[PDB]
Write a protein that binds this ligand. Structure first.
Ligand SMILES: [Cl-]
Ligand SMILES: [Cl-]
Ligand SMILES: [Cl-]
Ligand SMILES: [Cl-]
Ligand SMILES: [Cl-]
Ligand SMILES: [Cl-]
Ligand code: NA
Ligand code: NA
Lengths: 181, 317, 52, 320
């Protein structure tokens, strides 16, 4: 499609360049011919000067031809040219957007894959908590630990690491709310 | 600025826009119907936000904010002087109340979903407008380059025509002098009085020929520079509107972000109310010290709900 | 193709994202309980109570 | 506004994980850049994951443990504390020395983890620099070619201008000739074949020029179109290389910043280890020494614990 449009544009632009060339050439022939036609005309009023009065008028007719031909082709072409360049710019935009959507999908795919990883890590984190609570239940039941020293463990954790988790929770909630804690 | 202030700004800004009229540019007929439809819809969305959604959000949060302001804690132990019977009713009434608020929180979130989609639609329609204008201008610029080239070429025809006219004029002046010397040269001399008059006729020829070619060429040039001035006007208007829509697009995109943040804030409130409901329910149907565990947890959870309330209130002001 | 992709985005935005946020409430709640345990069991309390 | 060391590495990791692998299947000249980029990227994501769910937590853990122990044992008894056998005091010092030794080992281990982190970051930073360099060289190459193509297009435009000139010239001869042929024809009906030939000669020549020009034209526009397709192709390729290139330049910077941050972490842990070592020495030499020599070493150990606490705050700062 694009190749065809560029071809079509090249033709129209050529047509228009041609027409304008005709008009410049045309004008020169008319002025040139009017001079030849005028000298040849007052040389017949004195030999055989018809060979140049024809050449002079030939020039003028050719000239006027090129000019009026160029003018038709021109006034005719100009409208079509705008339509063609718009079609091209439109196709370029639409191909670019189609590509952009594709890339968009690829990116979303990656976001999802990253989300799987993240979710998996969350599951494993909860699994450690459950398993670790299980160990604590076992250790208490077997009499390896007591509620007196387990209490101290949890209160130490409350002073530091758990307090930290709670902080991170507030902070995370704030950041996803777009608020300053 | 608060999340709500950002959406509010976008809404006020979109409502103030004026629909476009590109009837003077046939090449933009489609951009017009696109822009005006897009705009009309966006104003719709804006109105809905300003007079229905924003107030609704502020309302629902006020109600929640007041209730939990009063019930800022959960009695875990059994307050001084109450039958265990009365305490269970007092916990059950709060649990019911919290459940009602959870539903309201959840409903607010649906409203916000709708808001997000409206904003996303507007943002998208705007991006589309800019893209379609850009492509029309990209097209017009290809054409403009050609027209400038075409004008430069035609200028040759005009230079030529004028050269013809000056050449003619010189022959006439030159001939009138030769004709005058040849005339007073019998003193034998018709060969130059012919040449002199020949020059004058040729000259008058060149002059009237040049004048045709000239009036004709200036017309082709004027026809070309009218197309150019038209394209320049069209490109200028597309750019003006384009930049407008680029700006609106940004405001809308910012509004999406803000609305998304609001969603997340309400989701925390809902989830946190859920935790509170669970903690109360499991405390109402549990042993003597297990009851205290769950109710202590419910009390921590209420503090959390109050936090969530401050966050939403911040988003609004 | 695009319409379907937007579908996928919606599913994330209005189904998964809330579930993830709920996860934070659940974490917040678990630790609310964990820090409550030593507050309700006074110093020196049955191994029986602790296990429950 | 300056972020912690861990925040900087964290950012780089999150940033690298979000990248999408490239597909230059439309550009044969970039086949090698593709396999380089994608391999580099894949590896980098590996490193990122390892940092985010294994190394960063490990660092935070080890420091928490250290931080708690020395929070409690924030000082060293240099004299015999009120009411204790000298026997009990020596056990209390020996238990701290053992404990400190355990922490020194943990500190030292953390440092090895960090070494590994540094090498991962250094590898990623390097692979990225490599990507940019290889893209740059492909673009440098394509630009040499592009310059030539522009030149080649300018040359061909002559052929096209020529062809069109031929066609206009032809047209004028035909119109001119048709007029001469018509006057010469109604001059034979008044006696003029010398000009009817000249007139028809013009028309034949003209029609020649027109059909000749039309071939040369359709042919030349094709050569020009063939050239500007190669150019548009090269422009697309250069544009893509530049887009990705700038991406990798940015990633390279993030990685380089991450190296710095990781190096700072190394140095912080080195101070902790060395400082714990001093504490171990001071305790050991105080446990096996005279009455006032004992007090010297234990006083020094007390100064040294303050130093360990400082080192702990520094690491904690690096993390938050
Ligand atoms: Cl309209
Ligand atoms: Cl409602
Ligand atoms: Cl538009
Ligand atoms: Cl290639
Ligand atoms: Cl370790
Ligand atoms: Cl590369
Ligand atoms: Na809209
Ligand atoms: Na790593």
């Amino acid at each position: 499609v694009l190749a065809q449009l560029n071809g079509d544009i090249d033709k129209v632009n050529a047509a228009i360049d041609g027409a304008i060339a005709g008009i410049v050439a045309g004008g020169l022939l008319v002025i040139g011919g009017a001079f030849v036609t005028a000298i040849g005309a007052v040389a017949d009023f004195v030999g055989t000067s018809t060979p140049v009065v024809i050449g002079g008028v030939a020039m003028m007719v050719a000239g006027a031809g090129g000019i009026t031909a160029g003018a038709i082709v021109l006034h005719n072409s100009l409208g079509a040219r705008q339509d063609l360049y718009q079609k091209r710019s439109s196709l370029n935009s639409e191909v670019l957007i189609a590509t952009q959507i594709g890339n968009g999908y690829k990116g979303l795919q990656v976001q999802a894959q990253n989300a799987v990883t993240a979710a998996t890590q969350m599951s494993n984190a909860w699994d450690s908590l459950t398993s670790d609570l299980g160990s604590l239940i076992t250790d208490l039941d077997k009499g390896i630990t007591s509620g007196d020293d387990i209490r101290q463990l949890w209160l130490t954790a409350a002073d530091t690491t758990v307090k930290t988790v709670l902080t991170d929770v507030t902070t995370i909630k704030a950041q996803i709310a777009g608020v300053s804690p | 600025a608060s999340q709500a202030m950002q959406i509010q700004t976008y809404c006020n800004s979109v409502k103030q826009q004026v629909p476009v009229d590109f009837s003077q540019f046939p090449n933009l007929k489609d951009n017009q119907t696109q822009i005006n439809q897009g705009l009309d819809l966006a104003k719709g969305h804006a109105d809905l936000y300003l007079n229905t959604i924003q107030p609704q959000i502020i309302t629902n949060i006020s109600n929640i904010s007041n209730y939990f302001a009063l019930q800022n804690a959960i009695p875990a132990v059994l307050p001084p002087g109450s039958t265990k019977a009365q305490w269970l009713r007092q916990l059950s009434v709060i649990k019911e109340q919290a459940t009602e608020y959870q539903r309201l929180s959840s409903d607010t979130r649906l409203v916000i979903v709708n808001l997000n989609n409206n904003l996303i639609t507007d943002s998208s329609n705007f991006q589309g407008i800019v893209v379609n204008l850009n492509s029309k201008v990209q097209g017009d610029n290809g054409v403009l380059a050609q027209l400038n080239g075409d004008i430069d070429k035609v200028n040759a025809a005009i230079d030529g025509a004028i050269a013809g006219i000056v050449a003619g004029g010189l022959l006439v002046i030159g001939g009138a002098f030769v004709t005058a010397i040849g005339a007073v040269a019998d003193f034998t001399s018709t060969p130059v009085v012919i040449g002199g008059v020949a020059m004058m006729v040729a000259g008058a020829g060149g002059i009237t020929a040049g004048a045709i070619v000239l009036h004709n060429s200036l017309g082709a040039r004027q026809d070309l520079y009218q197309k150019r001035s038209s394209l320049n006007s069209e490109v200028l208007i597309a750019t003006q509107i384009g930049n407008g829509y680029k700006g609106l697009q940004v405001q809308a995109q910012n509004a999406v972000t803000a609305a998304t943040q609001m969603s997340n804030a309400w989701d925390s409130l809902t989830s946190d109310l859920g935790s509170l409901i669970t903690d109360l329910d499991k405390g109402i149907t549990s042993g003597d010290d297990i009851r205290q565990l769950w109710l202590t947890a419910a009390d921590t959870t209420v503090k959390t709900v109050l936090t969530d309330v401050t966050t939403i209130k911040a988003q609004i002001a």
